Ligand SMILES: Nc1ncnc2c1ncn2[C@@H]1O[C@H](COP(=O)(O)OP(=O)(O)OP(=O)(O)O)[C@@H](O)[C@H]1O
């Protein structure tokens with residue numbers, strides 16, 4: 001029939017819509033969603049979300065209502081998913097990777113390989129950076145039997161954007177079972193600073209802060225002598241025995257370089273303070289792929305609203321069921 005979704009679910013952001021689009025294309029099940037981001041400062045469909053809808057529409061030849069900027073209602077009726085070479089432009093500093101997050105799962109079930117290229121923002125503060133997708137998520141997808149490779153072609157910063165991200169995807173031959181338990185011992189911690197159109201000395205200060213708190217196996221400075229810009233992100237990649245995570249902070253307008261590294265340090269020690277293998281963000285991004293695979297599990301310290309939202313949406317579209325059991329401040333998310 002028709003699946004009616006409440007956009008106010010969880011934190012009431014764009015996540016429910018992106019996950020809905022993915023699952024609708026895959027299952028063929030049509031859906032309607034009201035109150036899309038209705039509680040936000042900038043409510044309704046933004047350029048990122050509209051581009052996500054337009055991308056999903058082009059890929060499966062969908063019947064759509066309300067695909068417009070600021071629209072808080074969408075009706076989406078999917079058709080047949082087609083593999084191929086796709087290109088989309090957000091037209092702002094909107095997250096390229098979140099647009100990719102939307103349509104990539106559908107292409108896992110295509111006839112042949114596909115490629116999707118999206119232009120826009122590349123290092124948004126509240127989205128997975130292309131480097132996170134490539135180095136954290138995708139190695140885990142591969143273990144599940146999903147083959148996609150993401151490449152950042154060009155960096156785009158707020159507010160101009162102009163960045164470019166592309167992903168290559170092959171159809172899934174066979175799904176597998178990935179079971180992530182405790183995080184296990186730390187193998188390496190790599191610190192990285194991205195610079196573009198901002199003072200050079202900034203990077204050296206930020207790395208010094210990191211090394212004092214963890215001692216980095218790598219201290220990397222990546223200058224972008226182009227515009228590009230202006231932009232600055234500080235990352236910390238945490239490689240443990242059974243998993244690799246990555247945390248980042250975007251150096252902003254007013255804030256000093258000394259503190260942006262410090263708040264990254266706090267965020268990382270928070271992750272380290274738990275035995276949880278998966279961070280709060282990666283947790284919500286593993287729900288759909290594990291659901292589609294029919295099995296799998298992971299541990300996370302504190303299940304976010306986006307995590308629980310993705311679970312709820314999945315359960316509406318798929319016959320899979322998630323159990324969430326907490327053991328000593330750590331939550332095991334498993335498919336029953
Ligand atoms: N630092 C981070 N590293 C990796 N992934 C992240 C990070 N921050 C956010 N994400 C991911 O980006 C997505 C955020 O979804 P969400 O809909 O909340 O976007 P948003 O930027 O909060 O905008 P809004 O919520 O207003 O729509 C989630 O999948 C989350 O896991």
Ligand SMILES: [Co+2]
Pocket residue numbers: 011013014
């Ligand atoms: Co949000």
Ligand SMILES: [Co+2]
Pocket residue numbers: 220
């Ligand atoms: Co490098």
Ligand SMILES: [Co+2]
Pocket residue numbers: 152222
């Ligand atoms: Co780079």
